[PDB]
Design an enzyme around this catalytic site. Structure first.
Site, PDB file in Angstrom:
ATOM      1  N   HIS A  32       2.478 -57.058   4.325  1.00 41.98           N
ATOM      2  CA  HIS A  32       1.761 -55.850   4.778  1.00 41.98           C
ATOM      3  C   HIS A  32       2.589 -54.606   4.432  1.00 41.98           C
ATOM      4  O   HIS A  32       3.819 -54.641   4.588  1.00 41.98           O
ATOM      5  CB  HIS A  32       1.509 -55.928   6.286  1.00 41.98           C
ATOM      6  CG  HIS A  32       0.989 -54.663   6.902  1.00 41.98           C
ATOM      7  ND1 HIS A  32       1.687 -53.968   7.862  1.00 41.98           N
ATOM      8  CD2 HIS A  32      -0.172 -53.995   6.726  1.00 41.98           C
ATOM      9  CE1 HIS A  32       0.989 -52.915   8.245  1.00 41.98           C
ATOM     10  NE2 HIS A  32      -0.143 -52.908   7.566  1.00 41.98           N
ATOM     11  N   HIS A  82       2.830 -44.223   2.918  1.00 40.61           N
ATOM     12  CA  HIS A  82       2.386 -44.808   4.183  1.00 40.61           C
ATOM     13  C   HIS A  82       1.989 -43.657   5.098  1.00 40.61           C
ATOM     14  O   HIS A  82       2.846 -42.927   5.605  1.00 40.61           O
ATOM     15  CB  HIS A  82       3.450 -45.722   4.821  1.00 40.61           C
ATOM     16  CG  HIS A  82       2.911 -46.639   5.882  1.00 40.61           C
ATOM     17  ND1 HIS A  82       1.567 -46.937   6.003  1.00 40.61           N
ATOM     18  CD2 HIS A  82       3.543 -47.364   6.839  1.00 40.61           C
ATOM     19  CE1 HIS A  82       1.389 -47.767   7.014  1.00 40.61           C
ATOM     20  NE2 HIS A  82       2.573 -48.045   7.537  1.00 40.61           N
TER      21      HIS A  82
HETATM   22 CA   LIG Z   1      -1.128 -49.532   4.706  1.00 34.37          CA
END
Ligand SMILES: [Ca+2]
Ligand SMILES: [Ca+2]
Ligand SMILES: [Ca+2]
Ligand SMILES: [Ca+2]
Lengths: 296, 296
Positions: A32, A82
């Site tokens: 992830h 991010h």
């Molecule tokens: Ca992401």
């Protein structure tokens, strides 16, 4: 060479799996937010760091699914992000790393999920998708066929999991709906459906139950060969505290791994995890790879 | 020479379509208020800009219909306007761009609407119509024939869509009444009917539905060779941004583009759009050209 001990070579674990089996059916470890490993500022770390080792380490530890979040620049490039945070990595760097791994281990495939993570830079003339597709996707490393993609067609290539709208070039798994913070089931293409457990931002207990619930569905449905099960074990940050993705993973990873170890299931899905490392003991990605022994 | 792949060019996409097909039957991308690309001032752009690239860029991205609005000047020339806004472009410049494109791509045709946009400069000799027809239209680049105009007669020429009164010279499609802000049906000459959807000044939902309704009708009436369908995806400005032509286009263009992609129709009409560009992600103009596959 097709034997059970071959699943033990983490950099070549797909070698003994028959070419004719759909990728969907294989149990595959994923990372992830794969590109967050360069983050340094501890404030930035507690909120947005999900990995502590680079792409090649993740791959040599058995990960074959990569969660790539991109932002389009004014330069017809895509760099990783991010949320608002610039990671210190570009999409081209990921692709080079994947190509180098696939050259070393041509029995393997790399599945790359690609998502628009942040709004386009003001000077960009193209769309995120035309820019990805014209400047990157055209490389013959990217498999351009679809349907219920088989391992045999994937070996030595990168298989796209599209998470961006407006694709105009065939290949990989189509973009599909994707509601925020849910477990959902939909269609991918004429030959494939998908169930995804992606409840980031629930409390610890709901998260663990959701992971297990979706894993139970995939075990009980082990012969459903055209149904993708994607199970995110990752949980988003509570920020300043004892509730970082790091802290959650330190409990979630070995817990789910022990469950798998003890149950010895025939299928566990695509299990996408934070912090691939050799730190917390029963190792999740290892237990996930080992659930393929019934396919050899 | 003769296959559906030739629709992909898009400097030459009319080449594979049979010559005896009426232009009315072909699906054709057009640009709305084509001349507005030179506008720099942010207040002016918000109210009055509809395009961001020049005429040759438009043609090279597949546009074959051009919305020209002019004003008769002191010097008995026609210059382009968007209402009171002088654009920084003349009729002669558009015509010369069109000539060069047609020299480079002699299989194509260019369709030009001409409208009187603002009152004559008081110093001017005759009327707008008499100045156009005597000083511009007399060039043999302009097709002087009428009826249900065929592609074969149109190749290498400009086909006029007259939107001015007082015409004294034969050629192209006659002026026809044209009620404001409505979708309506009339006759053009003895050999052709028109349905036009031109609801500028209506809410977003009603606009998107009007576009689709007209398109649904045209895709259902594919064999109606007698019948022109003009569908404007453009919406007028609210004072903006957040309700700019640019703003509305960013959403409408890809939405209709995707609707066509999904429906795979054999006919979608003459689709006249704001902001022909590569910025948004399935491409409206491309999807309209592709709807000509059935003709080849
Ligand atoms: Ca992401
Ligand atoms: Ca099935
Ligand atoms: Ca106009
Ligand atoms: Ca009719």
């Amino acid at each position: 060479a097709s034997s059970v001990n071959e699943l033990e070579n983490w950099s070549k674990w797909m070698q003994p799996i028959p070419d004719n089996i759909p990728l969907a059916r294989i149990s595959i470890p994923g990372t992830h937010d794969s590109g967050t490993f360069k983050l340094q500022n501890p404030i930035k770390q507690v909120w947005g760091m999900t990995q502590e080792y680079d792409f090649r380490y993740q791959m040599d530890h058995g990960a074959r699914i990569f969660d790539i979040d991109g932002r389009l620049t004014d330069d017809n490039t895509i760099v990783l992000h991010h949320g608002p945070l610039y990671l210190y990595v570009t999409l081209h760097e990921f692709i080079n790393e994947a190509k180098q791994f696939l050259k070393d281990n041509p029995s393997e495939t790399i599945i790359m999920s690609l998502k628009k993570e942040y709004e386009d830079m003001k000077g960009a003339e193209g769309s995120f998708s035309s820019t990805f597709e014209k400047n990157y996707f055209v490389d013959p490393i990217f498999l351009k066929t679809e349907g219920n993609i088989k391992l045999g067609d994937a070996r030595g290539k990168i298989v796209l999991l599209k998470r961006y709208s407006g694709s105009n070039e065939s290949g990989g798994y189509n973009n599909f709906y994707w509601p925020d913070n849910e477990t959902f089931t939909t269609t991918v293409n004429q030959n494939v459906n998908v169930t995804v457990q992606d409840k980031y931002k629930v409390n610890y207990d709901e998260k663990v139950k959701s992971i297990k619930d979706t894993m139970d569905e995939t075990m009980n449905n082990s012969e459903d060969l055209n149904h993708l099960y994607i199970n995110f074990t990752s949980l988003s940050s509570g920020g300043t505290a004892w509730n970082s993705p790091y802290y959650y993973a330190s409990y979630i990873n070995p817990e789910i791994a022990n469950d798998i170890k003890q149950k010895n299931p025939t299928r566990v899905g695509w299990v996408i995890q934070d912090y691939i490392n050799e730190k917390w003991s029963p190792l999740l990605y290892q237990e996930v790879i080992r659930a393929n022994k019934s396919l050899i």
